[PDB]
Amino acid sequence: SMNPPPPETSNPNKPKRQTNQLQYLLRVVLKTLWKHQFAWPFQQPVDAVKLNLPDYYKIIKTPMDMGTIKKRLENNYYWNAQECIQDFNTMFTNCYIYNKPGDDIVLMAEALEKLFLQKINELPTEE
Numbered sequence: 001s002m003n004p005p006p007p008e009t010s011n012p013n014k015p016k017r018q019t020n021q022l023q024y025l026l027r028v029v030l031k032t033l034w035k036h037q038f039a040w041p042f043q044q045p046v047d048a049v050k051l052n053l054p055d056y057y058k059i060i061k062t063p064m065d066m067g068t069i070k071k072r073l074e075n076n077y078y079w080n081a082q083e084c085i086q087d088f089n090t091m092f093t094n095c096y097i098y099n100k101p102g103d104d105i106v107l108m109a110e111a112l113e114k115l116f117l118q119k120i121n122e123l124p125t126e127e
């Protein structure tokens with residue numbers, strides 16, 4: 001029922017890059033999802049205490065949220081685009097794993113995921 005430590009956004013010994021694909025993931029993908037009307041439940045780690053979801057972190061063992069992704073992108077945490085794309089997919093998948101079909105939160109994740117898929121479809125080639 002307690003909250004775990006959040007996912008790390010800083011790791012000095014992890015090698016990093018700033019690639020055109022990662023720039024796209026921040027400037028286009030993250031920005032688009034972040035401003036969406038349904039972004040709010042996904043802009044920070046799930047607070048299982050405040051939301052009274054005591055089993056959340058029993059079921060979700062790889063938590064991820066856009067607040068974490070935003071920090072990772074802004075602080076150059078990633079080596080490649082695949083790592084970041086995986087984080088987005090983890091976030092959506094967690095929502096579908098934990099909740100029921102037809103739940104508001106699932107409809108919200110689906111709307112964000114649709115836009116995500118449209119933006120990743122036009123991920124630029126590596127310069």
Ligand SMILES: Cc1cc2c(-c3cncc(N)c3)cnc(N[C@@H]3CCNC[C@H]3OCC3CCS(=O)(=O)CC3)c2[nH]c1=O
Nearest residue numbers: 040041042045046047051053094095098099100103104105
């Ligand atoms: C990422 C995420 C956020 C989130 C938030 C959430 C919402 N807003 C903001 C934040 N930060 C989290 C709230 N509830 C969740 N799950 C619950 C439990 C399973 N079914 C759907 C939700 O049910 C709430 C239910 C309460 C009684 S009712 O009002 O009659 C009908 C709705 C969530 N699951 C998730 O995976």
